[PDB]
């Protein structure tokens, strides 16, 4: 779809294309079915593969727009509660790994670097969202969901939380009676010191 | 150095305080 680009009066839009059909979904029929093999048969490299659609990118639109902006959240979503509940338990660890899909929070792969992508789609620490990136600022209109949705790295607060949850979990198991009463709390150390 | 050196880049917002509108809620004006 296209705006009237020859328009006389000045508008916030000057000219705007739409990729209406959002047929990127068809490539996703393919690759998503391929990932049906397994998780991690899902990849940020598939995220990178947005180039292989129309020679383009994955600034998604329509419900796929939503799924895209939700994309990491989609995956993270129960990890969120794997924290809420299961950081009191264990697979918080896995949730960490899943954040590590979204990002590299962990203390690792300094040398591997472009191992995780010769194109620097990722960054040493992918501080923005793996699909996403920073943008021009804007003037406010702001029901809370707007914030909950805002196109900004603030979301890293998540990682911060996750991390504190990790150490907090460790702290509680150390709240358990155990003569090795400092010991593995060293990880509480490592964590805290990571900030 | 140490392998995979730690780097919590607290990216520089140069964090500075922000006004509550509840204080001076009259801004509702």
Residue A79, token pair as written in the block: 């990890």
Q: Say whether B4 and A107 touch across the interface (CB within 8 A).
A: yes
Mutate to test the interface with A, among B3, B4, B10, B27 (most CBs of A within 10 A): B4
Q: In this structure, what DSSP letter does residue A2 have?
A: B
User: What is the distance between the alpha carbons of residues A64 and A123, in angstroms, rounded to a whole number?
Assistant: 25
From which experimental method does this structure derive? cryo-EM
B3: left (phi over 0), alpha (psi -120 to 50) or beta: beta
Which residues have a Cβ under 8 Å from the Cβ of A6 and sit 6 or more positions away?
A: none
Q: In this structure, what DSSP letter does residue A41 have?
A: S
CA of A179 to nearest chain B CA: how many angstroms apart? Answer: 30
User: Cβ of A11: how many Cβ atoms within 10 Å?
Assistant: 11
Q: Say whether B6 and A194 touch across the interface (CB within 8 A).
A: yes
Tell me which residue has tokens 């209406």. Answer: A20
Q: Say whether A110 and B9 touch across the interface (CB within 8 A).
A: no
- Residues preceding gaps in chain B (C to N > 2.5 Å): none
Q: Say whether B11 and A194 touch across the interface (CB within 8 A).
A: no
β strands within chain A, DSSP E? none
Any CB–CB contact under 8 A between A108 and chain B?
yes
- The answer to whether A47 and A117 have CB atoms below 8 angstroms apart is no
User: What is the distance between the alpha carbons of residues A19 and A30, in angstroms, rounded to a whole number?
Assistant: 19
- The answer to whether A131 and A51 have CB atoms below 8 angstroms apart is no
Residue A140, token pair as written in the block: 């406010």
Chain A residues whose CB is inside 8 A of the B5 CB are 110
Touching A: B residues 1-29, CB under 8 Å: 3-11
Tell me which residue has tokens 């500075």. Answer: B16
Q: Say whether A124 and B7 touch across the interface (CB within 8 A).
A: yes
The closest alpha carbon to A92, from A145, A169, A35, A158, belongs to A169
Chain A residues whose CB is inside 8 A of the B3 CB are 110-111
3-state DSSP call for residue A14?
A: coil
- The answer to whether A107 and B4 have CB atoms below 8 angstroms apart is yes
The CA-to-CA distance between both ends of chain A, in Å, stands at 48
Chain A residues whose CB is inside 8 A of the B7 CB are 124-125
Residue A169 exposed, middle or buried by CB count within 10 Å (0-12, 13-18, 19+):
buried
């Amino acid at each position: 779809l296209q705006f009237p680009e020859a328009s006389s009066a000045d508008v916030w839009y000057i000219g705007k294309q739409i990729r209406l059909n959002t047929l990127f979904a068809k490539e996703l029929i393919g690759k998503a079915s391929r990932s049906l093999d397994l998780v991690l048969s899902w990849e940020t490299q598939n995220s990178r593969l947005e180039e292989a659609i129309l020679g383009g990118a994955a600034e998604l639109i329509d419900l796929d727009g939503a799924n895209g902006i939700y994309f990491w959240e989609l995956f993270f979503h129960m990890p969120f509660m794997v924290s809420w509940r299961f950081n009191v338990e264990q697979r918080y660890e896995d949730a960490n790994r899943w954040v590590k899909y979204l990002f590299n929070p962990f203390e690792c792969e300094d040398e591997p670097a472009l191992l995780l992508g010769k194109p620097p789609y990722w960054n040493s620490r992918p501080l923005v969202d793996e699909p996403f990136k920073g943008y021009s600022l804007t003037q406010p209109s702001d029901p809370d969901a707007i914030a909950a949705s805002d196109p900004i790295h603030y979301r890293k607060a998540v990682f911060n939380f996750l991390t504190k949850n990790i150490i907090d979990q460790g702290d509680m198991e150390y709240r358990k009676l155990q003569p090795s009463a400092r010991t593995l709390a060293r990880l509480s150390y490592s964590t805290a010191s990571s900030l | 150095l140490f392998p995979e050196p730690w780097d919590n880049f607290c990216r520089p917002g140069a964090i500075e305080a922000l006004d509550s509108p509840a204080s001076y809620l009259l801004d509702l004006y």
